[model samples]
Target: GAIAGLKQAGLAGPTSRLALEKPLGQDLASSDHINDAVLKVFSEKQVYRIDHYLGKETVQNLLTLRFGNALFEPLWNSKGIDHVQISVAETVGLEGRIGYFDSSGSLRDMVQSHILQLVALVAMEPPAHMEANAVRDEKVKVFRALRPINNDTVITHTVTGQYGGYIDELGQPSDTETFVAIKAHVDNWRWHGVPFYIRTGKRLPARRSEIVVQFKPVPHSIFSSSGGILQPNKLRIVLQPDETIQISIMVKEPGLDRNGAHMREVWLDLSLTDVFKDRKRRIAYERLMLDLIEGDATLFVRRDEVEAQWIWIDGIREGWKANSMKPKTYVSGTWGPITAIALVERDGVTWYDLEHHHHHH
Candidate 1:
C-alpha cells in the first residue's frame, strides 16, 4: 500500500490520497530543545520522520559493502584501519535562514546526524544478522561508545567558527556558528585509540561530502625506490557533487620508466553510478520516507542517540565560555582559519585538497 501511495505521487500510477502532515507533537518543542513530547511524535508507528543521510544510495550500499564482501569484514577495525575522516563542506552562505542556522550550527546540522551516522557505519562490528535492525543495532553501539569530550580537551580537539559577524553579514549580531571541527574517539574494543575526525562548515571551500578510511602503513617496505615511499592504503566514499567509492593501492608503473626506480601509484574506482545500472537511484529523502512508511526504525535516530549527541556537542559550546576565547576569522573564499590547518597538521596529517588530487592514498 505504501508503494502504491508513492507511485501515485508520480504520474501513470494509482491515486491514493495520503494526508501529509507532521505528527501531533511535531512543533511542540522549540528547535533549541528537542524534548520527550517531540520525540513521542517519532515513536508513533504511523509517523514518518525522514533522515536524508540514511536514505542515501551509497549509505544503503554500505550494508552490501560489509555483508556482501567477505574480504573487508575481517579487517574493519583499529588493528587494520589507522584512522577515519568525515568531511562535509558547503560553498553557500546562509541566505535567509539566520535564525534556524544560528540555533542549529554545524554540529547539529551535519555532525549529529549525517557525519555520526557515517562513523557508526564504518566503525560498527558485524551484525549477527543482515536484517536492518540488526545492522542498526551495531551502529547504535558505536554511538554509545563515543568518548564524551571533556571541557579541558575541547579546546585542543574542537574548532568552531562563525561567518562574518552576524551584524555585518546579516544586519544583526547573531550567535550562529557556520563551521565546526571535532576530533572524536571511540572507547570500544574495536576502535579504541583510533581517532575519528569529523568536520563540517558552510561558505568556504567546494561543496563535497565524503568518508575517508586510512589504513595502517605496510609492516615493512621491501622495495627500494628513490622518489618517495609508498603511503598507506585509503578507501574513500564520496557523496555530494559526485558520488563514487575509490580504493587506492600502490601499483607498478606500466612502462619501464626510471628502471623501476620511480614510485608509482594507481587507484581502483568502484563508481556507484556505473555499477548500479538499471537500478533506480532515488535521493536520500525518498529512501528515508519509504522506511518511515514501512515502520522500519533502522534509519531513524533513536531517542538515546539524539540525547547523547546533544550532550557531547553542548560541552563544546560551554567549553568555549570556560576558555574565554574568540573565534578566528578567514576570508570568504578561503578554506578556513590557518589554525584549522595547524590542527590537523599537528597530528602528522593534512587536509585533502579536492582540486589537486582526486585520490587520497
Candidate 2:
C-alpha cells in the first residue's frame, strides 16, 4: 500500500474514485496518518473505504426489514426489546492472517470496523432518505453516542482470549487477542439501558454472523398458574455461515398440557431471500465494487464513524494495558473460552445460539 500510496497520487484523474480495504493502518494514529496523506490528493467523496461486511445482501436487506414492515417498525425500540446480540464467529484459525493478525488483534481487526458498523445499522435512528449522506449521518450519530469503556469497567465489560496454539503459530509471545466479547450501549433515548452485546472470535465452535434482537419477557404471564415459564420473543438476522432471518414467538401445540396451556416458542423463518429461490444474488465484493464505481457509500464506513470508533476502541486497548488484562487460552475446537461465556451470562444473559440449541430449544 505504501508503493500504491505513491502510485495513488499519480493515478487519480479528476474523475477518479478509489476503493480500499481494512488493515486501514494499524490503529487510529497510524490510520489517520496514512488517510491524511491519501486525502490530500483525493477528496473524501473521491475515495471508498470498503469492507465485505458493508455490502452483504443481508446488510442491504436490513434497511428494508425495519422500514418495509409496519409490524416490526412499531416495536423496534427499547420498550419492546430487551437486548441485542451481534455475533460473528469464525473457525478459520490464525495461520493465514497471523502475520497481520498478530499485530491487529480481534479488537482492531474486526470489532473496530465491521462489528461497530453493524451496531450502527442495528440501532441507528431512521434516516430522512436513502441518500448516502442522509443514511451515513444517522450512522455517525450511533457511533458518537457510544459510551466509552475505561479501565474501571473494562474488566467487567469485555473479555479477551487467544486460541491454544496461537503462540506456536505466531512463533513468539504476543498479547494480540484472538477473541473478544463486549457489552456495549448506544447511549441514546431509543436504546437507552438496552445493552448491545457484540462478540467476534477465531477458533469458535461455529462460523456464523448474526444479529439477535431479543424482546422483553412478558410482563405478567396469564398462564403462570401451570408453573410453566414464558419464553421471550427474539428476532434473528443471520448473515454469515447461512442466510436467513427468523422471529421466535409463543404458540400452542396440538393439545394443551393438564393446565390447559402449552406455550411453545416457534421460530418463523422470515426471509425475502427464501421467497425468490430462482434469483441468485451477487457476492459482497461485486456489490461493493459497483458501489465504488457509482460512488454509493451508504453501506460504507465514513471518516467520522472511523474517528469515533477508534476513539472508543483505543480506550479499551489502553484499558487492557492499564488493568493488566491478559489473554486467556482456549482450545482451537471450542468457543474462545469459558470467560467469554461468563462475560454475558453474568449479566443474566447467555449467547442466543447456545441458549437455543442443545437443550433450551
Please tell me which predicted candidate would have the highest lDDT against the true structure.
2
For all predictions, the C-alpha RMSD in Å is 6.6, 2.4
Per-candidate count of clashing residue pairs (backbone under 3 Å): 0, 0
TM-score of candidate 1 against the unseen true structure: 0.82
Runs in model 2 deviating more than 4 A are 1-13, 256-260, 271-274, 293-296, 354-357
lDDT of 1 by residue, 134-158 (tens): 7667877887788777778877887
lDDT of each: 0.66, 0.77
**Error of model 2, residue 355, in angstroms:** 6.7
Query: What lDDT is obtained when candidate 2 is compared to the true structure?
Result: 0.77
**Angstrom error at residue 338, model 1:** 1.5
Off by over 4 Å in 1: 1-35, 38-49, 164-167, 254-260, 275-281, 287-294, 354-361
lDDT of 1 at 224: 66
Candidate 1 to native Cα RMSD, angstroms: 6.6
Output the worst ten-in-a-row residue range by lDDT, candidate 1: 19-28
